[PDB]
Amino acid sequence: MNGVYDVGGTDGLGPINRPADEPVFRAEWEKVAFAMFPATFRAGFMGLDEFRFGIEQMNPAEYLESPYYWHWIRTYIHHGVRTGKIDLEELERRTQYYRENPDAPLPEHEQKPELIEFVNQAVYGGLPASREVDRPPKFKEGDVVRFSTASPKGHARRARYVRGKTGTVVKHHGAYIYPDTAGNGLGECPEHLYTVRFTAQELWGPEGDPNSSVYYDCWEPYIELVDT
Amino acid sequence: TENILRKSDEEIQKEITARVKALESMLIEQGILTTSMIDRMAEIYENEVGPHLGAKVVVKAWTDPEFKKRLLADGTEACKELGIGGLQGEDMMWVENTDEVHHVVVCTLCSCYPWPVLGLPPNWFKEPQYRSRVVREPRQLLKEEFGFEVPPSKEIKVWDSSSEMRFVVLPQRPAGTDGWSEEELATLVTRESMIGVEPAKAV
Ligand SMILES: OB(O)c1ccccc1
Ligand SMILES: [Co+2]
């Protein structure tokens, strides 16, 4: 979708806030938000592409100025409601309860070795998105291609600043999970993946830095040939 | 930046904390989240996985031309030689700074970052100010924000991580370090030098 999250090229967002140093986690709730990612993933709330799409549907003002891990909380709730695993009315009631009773305990629960095993395996083994497909790559290094002007409402990795732009294929990476299906609950449907080089003048006009380029990854349906 | 509509930081933290604790309580009752699971994830990214790992890769490339070749050919497989890899670094592509080219990495659509070699990203990397501007005015951004002047005749390549490919910058080895040990060289390698917003430390 054409959401505000797609910030590449946007002017006026302000100076960078960069403290001289900072902790990995700024508050205990951030640790909880972070760990909820493997928890909700294992429980089938969402995959990675769907996770991103939940964040993309946030209120734009809230997105732009909220602490980062609040984005993660929004997408958990979004998919919890979508899948029927989270009752919103109960969440609201519990929120008010912990507003009034911030030091009240969490529910009693058993620890689970399998959840630690899951964490360790995911962290050190990874969750590779590469896939084998039956079709050969349509494009190759050196091909001059144009990025699609399609504007799907659903999830995609189609930054507005590269749409309709012409670039050169730099590398073919093999095939990978396709966001335009996976992020919309339509499955992996893997597609060949390419890095494409766009000059700054192509992206930003005649004014552009004559000595800069942006490299952007394109799944096969995103691009079509101009010249081989 | 001033927004007259925005609550205080304290009020924002209070509200987020209640909402997160409420959600946490529900996921705990579903049996899918536990306190030990939370503590393990935090421990890993506070104490085990961080930019010291990337630094080991850089200094090996600096002192081993054959390894550097393998690193640039297939970043994932080369890093595995050092026992480095995993979540959000399943597909790594390293890019080499030279006298002719400077690389800088961004995720304009979100926050993507090579966790196995750099750990979790600093907040500025994930925020809209860096993300919006670096693809559009990288030379000016590097100068104004990071005090890093890239001469206009030198090409800047900005890598936008729109896929699961994770780009990592191999910074140039600082002058005056001939024959240094890997341990000594590692002191010059920063997280910032592997994002491309700063060079490796001089001297
Ligand atoms: O910005 B990212 O590509 C991202 C990856 C994993 C989890 C969360 C965010
Ligand atoms: Co991202």
Go through the domains of chain A in sequence order and give each one's CATH number. 1-126 (1.10.472.20), 130-228 (2.30.30.50)
Coil, strand or helix at A223:
strand
Of A91, A130, A212, the CB nearest to B26: A91
Q: Does residue B138 come out as left (phi exceeding 0), alpha (psi in the -120 to 50 range) or beta?
A: alpha
Distance from CA of B129 to the nearest CA of A (A): 5
Instruction: Count Cβ atoms below 10 Å from residue B148 Cβ, excluding itself.
Output: 17
Residue A64 CB contacts under 8 Å (≥ 6 apart), including other chains: A4, A13, B128
Q: Does residue A84 come out as left (phi exceeding 0), alpha (psi in the -120 to 50 range) or beta?
A: left
For Cα atoms A161, A163, A169, give the angle at the middle one, nearest 5 degrees.
Answer: 100
Sorted by where each starts, the structural domains of chain B and their CATH numbers stand as 1-203 (3.90.330.10)
- Distance CA(B51)–CA(B68), nearest Å, equals 18
Structure tokens, A24:
């990995």
Among the listed residues A151, A148, A192, A152, the one whose alpha carbon sits nearest the alpha carbon of residue A167: A148
- Distance CA(A181)–CA(A166), nearest Å, equals 24
- Strands A212-219, A191-199: pairing kind: antiparallel
- Catalytic one of B110, B132, B162, B181: B110
Structure tokens, A128:
């590779």
Coil, strand or helix at B199:
coil
**Contact assessment for residue A27 and residue B13, using Cβ atoms and an 8 Å cutoff:** yes
Contact assignment for B87 to A127 by CB distance below 8 Å: yes
d(CA B160, ligand 2 centre) in Å: 9
- Distance CA(B158)–CA(A197), nearest Å, equals 10
Question: Tokens 């890899």 — which residue?
Answer: B85
Coil, strand or helix at B102:
strand
**Contact assessment for residue B37 and residue A115, using Cβ atoms and an 8 Å cutoff:** yes
**Contact assessment for residue A194 and residue A172, using Cβ atoms and an 8 Å cutoff:** yes
Residue A13 CB contacts under 8 Å (≥ 6 apart), including other chains: A7, A64, B128, B129, B132, B133
- Distance CA(A159)–CA(B108), nearest Å, equals 8
- Distance CA(A158)–CA(A152), nearest Å, equals 9
CA–CA distance from B132 to each of A2, A47, B107 (Å)? 15, 26, 9
A28-42 helix and B9-29 helix, angle to the nearest 10 degrees = 30
CB crowding A6-20: b at 16 or more within 10 Å, else e: bbbbbeebeebebee
Coil, strand or helix at A209:
coil
Catalytic site residue B79? no
What letter would DSSP give residue A23? -
Q: At B173, which amino acid appears? A: R
Structure tokens, B199:
């060079």
A28-42 helix and A48-56 helix, angle to the nearest 10 degrees = 130
Return the residue whose CA atom lies nearest to atom 5 of ligand 1: B112
- Distance CA(B4)–CA(B8), nearest Å, equals 10
**Contact assessment for residue A88 and residue B28, using Cβ atoms and an 8 Å cutoff:** no
Q: What is the DSSP string of A104-138?
A: PPPPP----HHHHHHHHHHHHH----EE--SSPPS
- Distance CA(B86)–CA(A127), nearest Å, equals 7
For Cα atoms B197, A30, B163, give the angle at the middle one, nearest 5 degrees.
Answer: 50
Q: What is the DSSP string of A37-90?
A: HHHHHHTTS--HHHHHHHHHTS-HHHHHHS-HHHHHHHHHHHHHHHHT-S-HHH
Among the listed residues B194, B166, B165, B178, the one whose alpha carbon sits nearest the alpha carbon of residue B57: B194
**Contact assessment for residue A111 and residue B36, using Cβ atoms and an 8 Å cutoff:** yes
Residue A207 CB contacts under 8 Å (≥ 6 apart), including other chains: A201
**Contact assessment for residue A223 and residue A157, using Cβ atoms and an 8 Å cutoff:** no
d(CA B178, ligand 1 centre) in Å: 38
**Contact assessment for residue A72 and residue A37, using Cβ atoms and an 8 Å cutoff:** yes
For the four alpha carbons of A163, A168, A173 and A174, in that order, the dihedral sign comes to positive
For the four alpha carbons of A185, B128, B153 and B64, in that order, the dihedral sign comes to negative
**Contact assessment for residue A201 and residue B136, using Cβ atoms and an 8 Å cutoff:** no
How was this structure determined? It was done by: X-ray
Tell whether residue B107 is among the known ligand binding residues: yes
Catalytic site residue B181? no
CA–CA distance from A23 to each of B42, B168, B200 (Å)? 12, 22, 22
- Strands A212-219, A130-131: pairing kind: unpaired
Where would I find the beta strands (DSSP E) of chain B? 91-96, 101-106, 155-160, 165-170
Of A22, A171, A215, the CB nearest to B123: A22
Distance from CA of A114 to the nearest CA of B (A): 10
At residue B142, what are phi and psi to the nearest 5 degrees?
-60, -40
- Strands A166-176, B155-160: pairing kind: unpaired
**Contact assessment for residue A180 and residue A156, using Cβ atoms and an 8 Å cutoff:** yes
Enumerate helices (H) and strands (E) in chain B, giving the number of each.
Answer: 11, 4
Question: Tokens 């380029």 — which residue?
Answer: A213
Residue A131 CB contacts under 8 Å (≥ 6 apart), including other chains: A175, A176, A177, A188, A190
- Distance CA(B118)–CA(B121), nearest Å, equals 7
* Stated length of chain A: 228
Whether B7 has its CB under 8 Å from any CB of chain A: the answer is: no
- Distance CA(B80)–CA(A43), nearest Å, equals 29
